[PDB]
Structure 1
Amino acid sequence: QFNPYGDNGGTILGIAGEDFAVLAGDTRNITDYSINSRYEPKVFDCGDNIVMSANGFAADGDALVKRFKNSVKWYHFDHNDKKLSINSAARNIQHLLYGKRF
């Protein structure tokens, strides 16, 4: 039967300093025992000083990042280029995700 999901490996890590923060990840993309790419960025700068990474099934990972960035775009259009606070971003992502709870 058709299985809509897949696994592209990868691993990400995020640590928060006192006045800074870091988000890292390997740049390997795999499928079973094959390596699809030795360099395929996984951590992105979404703007307003917010870095993000959705790791797991790459297709879903990109769809999500893309959707979020698009959210930040409209946030600017809507609230006169107001900077999207990291906590607001967090709440917004929760809705993006839970929106597909099923």
Structure 2
Amino acid sequence: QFNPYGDNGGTILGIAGEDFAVLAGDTRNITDYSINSRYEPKVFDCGDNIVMSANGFAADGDALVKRFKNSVKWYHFDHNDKKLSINSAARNIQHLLYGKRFFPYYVHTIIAGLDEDGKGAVYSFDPVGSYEREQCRAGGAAASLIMPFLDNQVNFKNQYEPGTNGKVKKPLKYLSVEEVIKLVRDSFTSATERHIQVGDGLEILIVTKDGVRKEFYELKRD
């Protein structure tokens, strides 16, 4: 009985800043208990300051990124190189996914970029196209480990101002790119410690008005 689906592990992480966004992924690719590769990138620059990761069944993920990049190519052909805005990319990715509603891409999609006011944007998708814009999102294998941590550290959930009898929340604040990278690195070193499907390498794509830049960090290889 042919099973058309697989699981390639990996974990991804998007955080939006005031004038930047970040999309991170580990570089490890797995099959059951084996390591297929210690360095197979899964976060991609798709142009127009749009970065994207489709995590889960890597064959579906690759296919989806391919189809989307193509979608950009044609958007440009149709509209004299008009920038595809991030909200417009998101709605389009909704349709690519829901197009296969009855045989879905088995992936968790995240995209990051800047909105039309130059503010950092993250969008998160379910395998069939449901999406929302978010401030932070973890996806993939160790998302259940990393997301509550981000809730707490990126959005100050469950923190109160001391001396206020737990009546005054710690007020929301925009994090700098430095502070965001620190959180990303710590999220992944943590994921690497507790999840066997996370390790080897951490690739971060950083989007600003000036464009996309990349950083790489080693993770433990066991």
Shorter-chain TM-score bucket reads over 0.9
Structure 1 residue 60: Cα displacement? 0.1
Tell me the SS of whatever aligns to 1:54.
strand
- What value does the CA root-mean-square deviation take over the aligned residues? 0.2
In structure 1, the partner of 2:89 is 89
Structure 1 residue 66: Cα displacement? 0.2
CA distance in 2, matches of 1:81, 1:31: 40
**What is the TM-score normalised by the length of structure 2?**
0.45
Structure 1 residue 73: Cα displacement? 0.2
Q: Which has the higher helix share?
A: 1
Unaligned runs of 5+ in 2: 102-222
Structure 1 residue 67: Cα displacement? 0.1
Unaligned runs of 5+ in 1: none
Per-residue Cα deviation, 1:18-67 (whole angstroms, up to 9, x for no partner): 00000000000000000000000000000000000000000000000000
5 Å-filtered alignment, 1:44-63, equals: 44-63=44-63
Q: Give 4+ residue runs of structure 1 displaced > 6 Å after superposition.
A: none
Aligned length: 101
5 Å-filtered alignment, 1:31-42, equals: 31-42=31-42
CA distance in 1, matches of 2:26, 2:81: 33
* Percent identical residues: 100
In structure 2, the partner of 1:28 is 28
